[PDB]
Design an enzyme around this catalytic site. Structure first.
Site, PDB file in Angstrom:
ATOM      1  N   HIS A 127       0.852  -1.202   0.000  1.00  7.19           N
ATOM      2  CA  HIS A 127       0.000   0.000   0.000  1.00  7.19           C
ATOM      3  C   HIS A 127       0.882   1.244   0.000  1.00  7.19           C
ATOM      4  CE1 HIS A 127      -3.145  -2.874   1.019  1.00  7.19           C
ATOM      5  NE2 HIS A 127      -2.388  -3.277   2.024  1.00  7.19           N
TER       6      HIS A 127
ATOM      7  N   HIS B 245       5.259   6.699   7.062  1.00  4.01           N
ATOM      8  CA  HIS B 245       4.982   6.370   5.672  1.00  4.01           C
ATOM      9  C   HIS B 245       4.411   7.606   4.971  1.00  4.01           C
ATOM     10  CE1 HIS B 245       1.178   5.803   7.825  1.00  4.01           C
ATOM     11  NE2 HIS B 245       0.622   6.213   6.698  1.00  4.01           N
TER      12      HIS B 245
ATOM     13  N   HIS C 157       1.749   9.143   1.543  1.00  2.00           N
ATOM     14  CA  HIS C 157       0.739   8.958   0.496  1.00  2.00           C
ATOM     15  C   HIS C 157       1.071   9.954  -0.605  1.00  2.00           C
ATOM     16  CE1 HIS C 157      -1.775   6.865   3.531  1.00  2.00           C
ATOM     17  NE2 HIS C 157      -1.198   7.739   4.338  1.00  2.00           N
TER      18      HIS C 157
ATOM     19  N   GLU D 213      -3.611  13.527   1.560  1.00  2.00           N
ATOM     20  CA  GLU D 213      -4.877  13.059   2.113  1.00  2.00           C
ATOM     21  C   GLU D 213      -5.661  14.231   2.710  1.00  2.00           C
ATOM     22  OE1 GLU D 213      -3.994   9.420   4.504  1.00  2.00           O
ATOM     23  OE2 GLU D 213      -4.764   8.484   2.683  1.00  2.00           O
TER      24      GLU D 213
ATOM     25  N   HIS E 124       3.049  10.711   7.194  1.00  2.00           N
ATOM     26  CA  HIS E 124       2.420  10.353   8.456  1.00  2.00           C
ATOM     27  C   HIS E 124       3.396   9.673   9.414  1.00  2.00           C
ATOM     28  CE1 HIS E 124      -1.775  10.285   6.325  1.00  2.00           C
ATOM     29  NE2 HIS E 124      -1.397  11.507   6.647  1.00  2.00           N
TER      30      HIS E 124
ATOM     31  N   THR F 131      -6.292   6.338   8.274  1.00  2.00           N
ATOM     32  CA  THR F 131      -6.803   6.612   6.925  1.00  2.00           C
ATOM     33  C   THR F 131      -6.725   5.406   6.003  1.00  2.00           C
ATOM     34  OG1 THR F 131      -4.691   7.314   6.001  1.00  2.00           O
ATOM     35  CG2 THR F 131      -6.057   9.002   7.085  1.00  2.00           C
TER      36      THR F 131
HETATM   37  N1  LIG Z   1      -2.472   6.374   7.374  1.00  2.00           N
HETATM   38  S1  LIG Z   1      -2.346   6.383   8.885  1.00  2.00           S
HETATM   39  O1  LIG Z   1      -1.259   7.317   9.304  1.00  2.00           O
HETATM   40  O2  LIG Z   1      -3.721   6.887   9.537  1.00  2.00           O
HETATM   41  C1  LIG Z   1      -1.942   4.760   9.528  1.00  2.00           C
HETATM   42  C2  LIG Z   1      -1.736   3.659   8.684  1.00  2.00           C
HETATM   43  C3  LIG Z   1      -1.413   2.405   9.229  1.00  2.00           C
HETATM   44  C4  LIG Z   1      -1.196   1.171   8.330  1.00  2.00           C
HETATM   45  O3  LIG Z   1      -1.865   1.337   7.076  1.00  2.00           O
HETATM   46  N2  LIG Z   1       0.230   0.851   8.094  1.00  2.00           N
HETATM   47  C5  LIG Z   1       0.467  -0.376   8.559  1.00  2.00           C
HETATM   48  O4  LIG Z   1       1.562  -0.923   8.504  1.00  2.00           O
HETATM   49  C6  LIG Z   1      -0.649  -0.979   9.131  1.00  2.00           C
HETATM   50  C7  LIG Z   1      -0.824  -2.224   9.738  1.00  2.00           C
HETATM   51  C8  LIG Z   1      -2.074  -2.583  10.239  1.00  2.00           C
HETATM   52  C9  LIG Z   1      -3.148  -1.696  10.141  1.00  2.00           C
HETATM   53  C10 LIG Z   1      -2.978  -0.448   9.538  1.00  2.00           C
HETATM   54  C11 LIG Z   1      -1.722  -0.092   9.031  1.00  2.00           C
HETATM   55  C12 LIG Z   1      -1.302   2.252  10.613  1.00  2.00           C
HETATM   56  C13 LIG Z   1      -1.500   3.337  11.450  1.00  2.00           C
HETATM   57  C14 LIG Z   1      -1.820   4.583  10.909  1.00  2.00           C
HETATM   58 CL1  LIG Z   1      -2.071   5.906  11.993  1.00  2.00          CL
HETATM   59 ZN   LIG Z   2      -0.994   7.378   6.429  1.00  4.85          ZN
END
Ligand SMILES: NS(=O)(=O)c1cc([C@@]2(O)NC(=O)c3ccccc32)ccc1Cl
Ligand SMILES: [Zn+2]
Ligand SMILES: [Hg+2]
Length: 256
Positions: free
Chosen positions: A61, A91, A93, A103, A116, A195
């Site tokens: 992703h 990470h 986006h 986002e 993020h 998100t």
């Molecule tokens: N996009 S995000 O910052 O809201 C976010 C994304 C993730 C994730 O997409 N990134 C991951 O590695 C992961 C693993 C399990 C569930 C969700 C995720 C995890 C926490 C957060 Cl705060």
């Molecule tokens: Zn994120």
């Protein structure tokens, strides 16, 4: 499973994750003229001096830079937060074109990308327990625009080659997340969610007003990453952002 394409993207998510249409979903548009300065906000404290990075992972992703969180080493506190939140990963986006990718949006303006930095509340013992709590997580969000290169990002850019496809990881020790921050910590804050699925409503969002600039060739290499695993048809990792969601009369507070 879930993705960003036509058939598995953001408005398919609600089917496996009903909370996608919940009361505190992220991201949102930040309407600067509606956001109110909040005097009760304490100074924001970003302490990343002792940060212990371990590895970088293409998870199909995005890519995660993961940190050792078994001790208080890289912590977020203050601002709208009570107690101490530990950095677990960061990470991004990003889009297929410079005119999209973030986002969060600002007066409907989309940036080229969004960073993020994800942190969990220590009163809960670990990440898995914290994501079962309304105040389990804190995410520091930072906008990216295309212009001059971001030096503190190049080590990440340079390793993307090694993690081109899903499930690939590489050693990524001694990375300093301080090189990703803009100058100002002026921010907007609101209660929200992950998100990405499971879209859990456990996040205090802290979105910095000042974007960082990255070079055209830095973002271009983000765009060379793959959503697919090795030996599968190439699916460029681009446009991995969820669009803005209903505010639902949450209040966005400004630190400034
Ligand atoms: N996009 S995000 O910052 O809201 C976010 C994304 C993730 C994730 O997409 N990134 C991951 O590695 C992961 C693993 C399990 C569930 C969700 C995720 C995890 C926490 C957060 Cl705060
Ligand atoms: Zn994120
Ligand atoms: Hg939660």
């Amino acid at each position: 499973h879930w993705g960003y394409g036509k058939h598995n993207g953001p408005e398919h998510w609600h089917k496996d994750f009903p909370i996608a249409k919940g009361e505190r979903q992220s991201p949102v548009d930040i309407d600067t003229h509606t956001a109110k300065y909040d005097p009760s906000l304490k100074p924001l404290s970003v302490s990343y001096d002792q940060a212990t990075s371990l590895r970088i992972l293409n998870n199909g992703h995005a890519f995660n830079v993961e940190f050792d969180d078994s001790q208080d080493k890289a912590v977020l506190k203050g601002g709208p937060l009570d107690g101490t939140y530990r950095l677990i990963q960061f990470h991004f986006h990003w889009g297929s074109l410079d005119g999209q990718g973030s986002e969060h949006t600002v007066d409907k303006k989309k940036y080229a990308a969004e960073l993020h930095l994800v942190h969990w509340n220590t009163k809960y013992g670990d990440f898995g327990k914290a994501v079962q709590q309304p105040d389990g997580l804190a995410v520091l969000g930072i906008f990216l625009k295309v212009g001059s290169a971001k030096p503190g990002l190049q080590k990440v850019v340079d390793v993307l080659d090694s993690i081109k496809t899903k499930g690939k990881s590489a050693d990524f020790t001694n990375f300093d997340p301080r090189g990703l921050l803009p100058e100002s910590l002026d921010y907007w804050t609101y209660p929200g969610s992950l998100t990405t699925p499971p879209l859990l409503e456990c996040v205090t969002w802290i979105v910095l007003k000042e974007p960082i600039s990255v070079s055209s060739e830095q973002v271009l290499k983000f765009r060379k990453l793959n959503f697919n695993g090795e030996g599968e048809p190439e699916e460029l990792m681009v446009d991995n952002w969820r669009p803005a969601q209903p505010l639902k009369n949450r209040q966005i507070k400004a630190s400034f």
